[PDB]
Design a protein around this ligand. Structure first.
Ligand SMILES: [Mg+2]
Ligand SMILES: [Mg+2]
Lengths: 56, 142, 193, 99, 216, 136, 43
RNA sequence: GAAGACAUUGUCAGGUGGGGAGUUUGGCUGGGGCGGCACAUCUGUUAAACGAUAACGCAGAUGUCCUAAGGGGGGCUCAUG
RNA sequence: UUGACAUUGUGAAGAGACAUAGAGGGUGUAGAAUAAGUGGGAGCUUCGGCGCCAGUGAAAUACCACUACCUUUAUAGUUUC
RNA sequence: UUGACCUCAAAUCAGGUAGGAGUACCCGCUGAACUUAAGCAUAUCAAUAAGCGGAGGAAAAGAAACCAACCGGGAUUGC
C-alpha cells in the first residue's frame, strides 16, 4: 500500500464497492475476467520456477 | 545521423521504418487510390523487431517516413550469467552489456551453452537499444 | 508591388484614416476669436496686465542648458528673499512655484532682482477707495524681457600652458572608464593580508 | 561633488556656486514617530504572530537564517523584505528569550 | 569537478605520511581508489565498461601469463614472461581444478589474435566468470610493451554490486604523479558514468595497510 | 473568478487567436462591479468609495459609501456639495471612482503612455491626420 | 445522413467505427453502447 | 433528518476530446488523373566544325568515398602474347 | 477526468520516507569452520600465532577498507500517507 | 411589570429622487470578420464596426509615488 499507483485504485473501491459481499465480488470479477488474469500471472510464476527445475 | 528520411513509395517489403518512435520491419504494403482524382494512400503493416508487436500506419504516398539504421553484428559467446550475455568481438574486444534473450530463443541458447556448443550470436542495433535475435554453431574452426 | 529603383516608403494608411481627417479650415477664424478672447479678458481685468510675472530659469538637458528661458513660477525662497509672502505675491500678480528649488546662486540672484524691479514698477491700488486709473500695458513679459547672460568678454590674452585640450579630454574619459577596476584592485591589494 | 568644468569624466559639468536649499518635509515621510511606535508595539503585543511568522521562528530555531530567508523570500515578495522580516523575527526571538 | 586538486594534495600528504614514516610495512603498499555509485540500477541501466592506461605503472611486478603461438612464445622467452602453448592448453584437457588453479595463479592473461578464438573452446567460461579474460596481442606489437600496458591498465565495469575499486598506484611514487593519476582516474570514472558527478556516491582513497580517507 | 466568454457551446467562429473561452479576465475589478450594482440599486444616491471587508472562495465582500445629493446637509456644507453637480451622475459607471481610475490606468508617468488622458482619446489623437491650409 | 448522426452515411448501411463508446466521450458522440463491459449474446 | 471539514465552488496544471472551430491538401505535363522527374546537378550525343541552342529526345550518372585514394621525393613499368 | 492551492476549523492513533549520532547482523552443498559481496594483499604478528603454497568450493580464507541489504535506538528533528 | 438600546420591518405616513428620449463630440465595458501577408495559422485590419452601461455644454485629465541625469526642469490639455 506504499508502492506507486495503489491509492488511486483504493479510492474507487471506497467510492463504489463499499457495500458489497464476497459472493457478488467473486461473481463480478469472474464476469469481468480479471480472475483469469490473476490465475495466468501465478501460472507464469509456476513455469518460471519449473523451467529452472527442468534445467537442473 | 541515427535515422534518415525516405518516401512511402520508395519503401518496400522487408525494410525498416519508424512507427510511433519504434524500429519496425514491414510485412505488408498496400496502396489504394483515395478518390478517383486523388493520389493513392499507402497502408503499411509492420512488426517491431524488439517486442514483436504489430503496428500499422496509413499515409499519403508522397509523404516522407522516418527510417532507422539497423546494424547486425556477429559475436562469439563467452558466458551467460545473470541474464547478461558476454560476447567477444573480432580483434578481441569484449562486451557484457547485452541482456540475454527471454523467450524460446533464450531457452534454446541457455540449453546449448549448458551442453557446450560454440555459439555464434547475432545482435542488432537500432535507435540506441540492443538485442540478440539468432544463434548458430560454427561448422569449422572448432 | 515592388518596382523600379525607388526608396522604400512607409505610408501608414491601412486603417480607416479617412474617418479621422482634421483639416484646419478654421485657422483664420480661430485666430480672430482668440484675439477677441484676449481683448474681452483685458477689458474684464482692465487695469491688470493679462499675464503673470515668470522667473528666469535654466533649461534642462545638455542640448539646451546653454540657454535660459521662462519658468512656471518663483521659488518660495526667492519670494522670501524679495521680502513678501507667497500668498501676497500670488494676489499682486507673481507666479509662485512651490516645487522648484534653488541650487544656483546666479539664477537665484537674477530672480530676486527681477522681483525687485517688478515691485518697483507696479502700482498696487487700495482695496476700498479712489482707484487712481493707470492705463494698463498688456504684457509683463514684454516689460520684463528675458535676457541671456553675458558669459565672457570678446577680447582677452592668450593663456597657453601646454595640455592641448585633447589629451585632457582623453585622459578624463580613460580614468572614468577604468575607475571601478582600480578600486577593485586597490581593495584586493588592501585585503591581501 | 563639485563639477570639473569639462564636458566628460567623473564629475563633468559647469562649475556654478551652490546654494544647498532648505530640506523638504515630504522627504521624511517614512520616519517613525513616538506615537506610532507605541501603537505598533501595543498592537504587536495584542495580536501576536501570523502562521508564516511562527514557522519562520521555527526556521531560525532549527534550520538557520539562510533557509529562513529563502522561505521568507518565497512568502513575501522580494529579498529585501525577506531580509528585514528575518531580522525583526530574530529580534522577537531575542526579546522572548529575554522574557 | 566537485573534487579539488588542493584537497587531493592534502589527503595524499597525510596518506603518504602514514604509509611511509609512521608505520612502514615490508611489502610495497598499493594506493587504492574505492568508489560507490548512487541512484543507479545494474538491472535496467546500461552497464558501463571502460579502460585507461596510466603513464606510470601501479603494479610493476604482478604476475601475467601469455597464451601464445610459436612466434609469441619465442618473443616471450626474450620478455621473460611465463607462457604455455596451444599444445600445452590441449594438454590441460578442460580439467576444472587445474584451470581454476591457473586462474588463481595469474591475475592477467595476454593472448594472440589467432588463438583468442579457441581460448574459450580449450578453456571454457570460468575465465569470464572470474573476470580475468585474455587481452589480444598481435605480431606487430611489442609483448613487453603490452605487459607494461596491462600492468598499467585501469578498468571500470559495472557488474552487479554498485561499488568498484581500482589500484591507482604505489605509495612509493612521487606526490604529483599520485595526484595526477588519481585525478585522471576519477575523471575517467565520471566520463564513463552517465549524468556525471551526481551519480557519484563516495570516493575513498586508501593505502595498502592504511586507513580510509574520504574525497566527497 | 474569471469571466467565461458567453458563447453557445464554446464556438467563437473566427481565427484561432480568439478561440479562448475559459481563462479570459474581466478588465474591471470586482470592487467596480460591486459598486456599480449598488448604484443601480440606489440610483438616487451617489457612489463615493468602496472598501474590501471580507472574502471566501466564492464571494468577495465590499462596503460602498454613498451620499444623498438631495439632502440639505449635503446641499449645504461646501466641502461636499460638489457631488450635487450633474457631471457626477454615475461616477462608478463612468469609471471615475478610485478603483475606476485604477482600472482605466489614469496615472502620471512613463508607464502610462497608452492610458494617461484616456486610451481612446490618445488613440484618436495619434491616429488623426492633421492638414493645414498651407500644407507643411 | 452523416450530418444527422455518427452512424449515418455510406454507400451501404453500416456503422463504420466500433459502436462501443467511451464513458469519457462528449455530447454528440455518445450514440451506441455507452461504456460496454462486454457485448454479444452470451450462451 | 442526512452528510461533514470530505464533497461543492474558485484558479492553475496534466490527460481525454471531429462533439465543435479555423485552415491546408506542390509543379511540369502533346487535357487532367495514374506513371515519370525532363524540379538542383554531371559526361557523351542530338547540335548544323567559335559560343549559345529545345522536346516526357537517345545512352548513362550524383546526394557518396578517401589520413590516404591528400602533399613532396625516390625506384620501377603496365594489359597481353 | 486527475492533481495542487484556497474555501478549511477543531481532536486522537498507526505506518512510511529523509538529515546526522551511534549500534549489532548474514548458515543449499562441499570445505577446519556461518562464504553478503567487491577490491587490495604476501607477509601481517598482540599469540609467535594467523594467512600464503595446500585442501575444498562458482566465489578462500590472515591483515585492511568500501558498498549495498537488514534489524536497531535518539532528536525541542524535517516530514508525507 | 415598566422604561431603554441594538437590529429588522410596515404604512395611499411628511418631503424628495431614479428610470425614457437624444447620442455629432465625451467616459467605460464588450468585441469580430471581410481585407493584407500575392497561399495561411502568429500578425494585420483593430485595441476598429456591430452590442451594452453612463454624462455635459463640453466631457475627460489635472496640481507629481512626474520628467530627468543637466548650470536641471515643474499641474493638466492642445498645436
Ligand atoms: Mg464570473
Ligand atoms: Mg455510416
Amino acid at each position: 500500500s506504499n508502492v506507486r499507483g495503489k491509492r488511486g485504485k483504493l479510492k474507487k473501491i471506497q467510492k463504489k464497492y463499499a457495500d458489497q459481499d464476497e459472493t457478488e465480488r467473486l461473481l463480478r470479477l469472474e464476469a469481468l475476467g480479471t480472475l483469469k488474469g490473476i490465475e495466468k500471472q501465478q501460472q507464469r510464476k509456476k513455469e518460471e520456477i519449473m523451467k529452472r527445475e527442468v534445467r537442473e | 545521423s541515427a535515422t534518415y528520411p525516405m518516401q512511402c513509395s520508395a519503401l518496400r517489403k522487408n525494410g525498416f521504418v519508424v512507427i510511433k518512435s519504434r524500429p519496425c520491419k514491414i510485412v505488408d504494403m498496400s496502396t489504394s487510390k483515395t478518390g478517383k482524382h486523388g493520389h493513392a494512400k499507402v497502408h503499411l503493416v509492420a512488426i517491431d523487431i524488439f517486442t514483436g508487436k504489430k503496428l500499422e500506419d496509413l499515409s499519403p504516398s508522397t509523404h516522407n517516413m522516418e527510417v532507422p539504421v539497423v546494424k547486425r553484428n556477429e559475436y562469439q559467446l563467452l558466458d551467460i550469467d545473470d541474464g547478461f550475455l558476454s560476447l567477444m568481438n573480432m580483434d578481441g574486444d569484449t562486451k557484457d552489456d547485452v541482456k540475454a534473450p527471454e523467450g524460446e530463443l533464450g531457452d534454446s541458447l541457455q540449453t546449448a551453452f549448458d551442453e557446450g556448443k560454440d555459439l555464434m550470436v547475432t545482435i542488432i542495433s537500432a535507435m540506441g537499444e540492443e538485442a540478440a535475435i539468432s544463434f548458430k554453431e560454427a561448422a569449422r574452426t572448432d | 508591388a515592388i518596382s523600379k529603383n525607388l526608396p522604400i516608403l512607409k505610408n501608414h494608411f491601412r486603417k480607416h484614416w479617412q474617418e479621422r481627417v482634421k483639416v484646419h479650415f478654421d485657422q483664420a477664424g480661430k485666430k480672430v476669436s482668440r484675439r477677441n478672447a484676449r481683448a474681452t479678458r483685458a477689458a474684464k481685468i482692465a487695469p491688470r496686465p493679462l499675464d503673470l510675472l515668470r522667473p528666469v530659469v535654466r533649461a534642462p538637458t545638455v542640448k539646451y542648458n546653454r540657454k535660459v528661458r521662462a519658468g512656471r513660477g518663483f521659488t518660495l525662497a526667492e519670494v522670501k528673499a524679495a521680502g513678501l509672502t507667497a500668498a501676497y505675491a500670488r494676489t499682486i500678480g507673481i507666479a509662485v512655484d512651490h516645487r522648484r528649488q534653488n541650487r544656483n546662486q546666479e539664477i537665484f540672484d537674477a530672480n530676486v532682482q527681477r522681483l525687485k524691479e517688478y515691485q518697483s514698477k507696479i502700482i498696487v491700488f487700495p482695496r476700498n477707495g479712489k482707484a487712481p486709473e493707470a492705463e494698463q500695458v498688456l504684457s509683463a513679459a514684454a516689460t520684463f524681457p528675458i535676457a541671456q547672460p553675458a558669459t565672457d568678454v570678446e577680447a582677452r590674452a592668450v593663456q597657453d600652458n601646454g595640455e592641448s585640450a585633447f589629451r585632457t579630454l582623453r585622459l578624463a574619459r580613460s580614468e572614468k572608464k577604468f575607475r571601478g577596476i582600480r578600486e577593485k584592485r586597490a581593495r584586493e591589494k588592501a585585503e591581501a593580508e | 561633488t563639485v563639477k570639473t568644468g569639462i564636458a566628460i569624466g567623473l564629475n563633468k559639468g559647469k562649475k556654478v556656486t551652490s546654494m544647498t536649499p532648505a530640506p523638504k518635509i515630504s522627504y521624511k515621510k517614512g520616519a517613525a514617530s513616538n506615537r506610532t511606535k507605541f501603537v505598533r508595539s501595543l498592537v504587536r503585543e495584542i495580536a501576536g504572530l501570523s502562521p508564516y511568522e511562527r514557522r519562520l521562528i521555527d526556521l531560525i530555531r532549527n534550520s538557520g537564517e539562510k533557509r529562513a530567508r529563502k522561505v521568507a523570500k518565497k512568502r513575501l515578495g522580494s529579498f529585501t523584505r525577506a531580509k528585514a522580516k528575518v531580522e525583526e523575527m530574530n529580534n522577537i526571538i531575542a526579546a522572548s528569550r529575554r522574557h | 569537478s566537485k573534487i579539488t586538486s588542493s584537497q587531493v594534495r592534502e589527503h595524499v600528504k597525510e596518506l603518504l605520511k602514514y604509509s611511509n614514516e609512521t608505520k612502514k610495512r615490508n611489502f610495497l603498499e598499493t594506493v587504492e581508489l574505492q568508489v560507490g555509485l548512487k541512484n543507479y540500477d545494474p538491472q535496467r541501466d546500461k552497464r558501463f565498461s571502460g579502460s585507461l592506461k596510466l603513464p606510470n605503472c601501479p603494479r610493476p611486478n604482478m604476475s601475467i601469463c601469455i597464451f601464445g603461438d610459436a612466434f609469441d612464445v619465442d618473443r616471450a622467452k626474450s620478455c621473460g614472461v611465463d607462457a604455455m602453448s596451444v599444445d600445452d592448453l590441449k594438454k590441460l584437457n578442460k580439467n576444472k581444478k587445474l584451470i581454476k588453479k591457473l586462474s588463481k595463479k595469474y591475475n592477467a592473461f595476454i593472448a594472440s589474435e589467432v588463438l583468442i578464438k579457441q581460448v574459450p573452446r580449450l578453456l571454457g567460461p570460468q575465465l569470464s566468470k572470474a573476470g580475468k579474460f585474455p587481452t589480444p596481442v598481435s605480431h606487430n606489437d611489442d609483448l613487453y610493451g603490452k605487459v607494461t600496458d596491462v600492468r598499467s591498465t585501469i578498468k571500470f565495469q559495472l557488474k552487479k554490486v554498485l561499488c568498484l575499486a581500482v589500484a591507482v598506484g604505489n605509495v612509493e611514487m612521487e606526490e604529483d604523479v599520485l595526484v595526477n593519476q588519481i585525478l585522471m582516474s576519477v575523471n575517467f570514472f565520471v566520463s564513463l558514468l552517465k549524468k556525471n558527478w551526481q551519480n557519484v556516491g563516495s570516493l575513498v582513497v586508501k593505502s595498502s595497510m592504511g586507513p580510509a580517507f574520504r574525497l566527497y | 473568478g474569471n469571466r467565461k466568454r458567453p458563447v453557445p457551446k464554446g464556438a467563437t467562429y473566427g481565427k484561432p487567436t480568439n478561440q479562448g473561452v475559459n481563462e479570459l479576465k474581466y478588465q474591471r475589478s470586482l470592487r467596480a462591479t460591486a459598486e456599480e450594482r449598488v448604484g443601480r440599486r440606489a440610483a438616487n444616491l451617489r457612489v463615493l468609495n468602496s472598501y474590501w471587508v471580507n472574502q471566501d472562495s466564492t464571494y468577495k465582500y465590499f462596503e460602498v459609501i454613498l451620499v444623498d445629493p438631495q439632502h440639505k446637509a449635503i446641499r449645504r456644507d461646501a466641502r461636499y456639495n460638489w457631488i450635487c453637480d450633474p457631471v457626477h451622475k454615475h461616477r462608478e459607471a463612468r469609471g471615475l471612482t478610485a478603483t475606476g481610475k485604477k482600472s482605466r490606468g489614469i496615472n502620471k508617468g512613463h508607464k502610462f503612455n497608452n492610458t494617461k488622458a484616456g486610451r481612446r482619446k490618445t488613440w484618436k489623437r495619434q491616429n488623426t491626420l492633421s492638414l493645414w491650409r498651407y500644407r507643411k | 445522413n452523416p450530418v444527422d448522426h455518427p452512424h449515418g452515411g455510406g454507400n451501404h448501411q453500416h456503422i463504420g467505427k466500433a459502436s462501443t463508446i467511451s464513458r469519457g466521450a462528449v455530447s454528440g458522440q455518445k450514440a451506441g453502447l455507452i461504456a460496454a463491459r462486454r457485448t454479444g449474446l452470451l450462451r
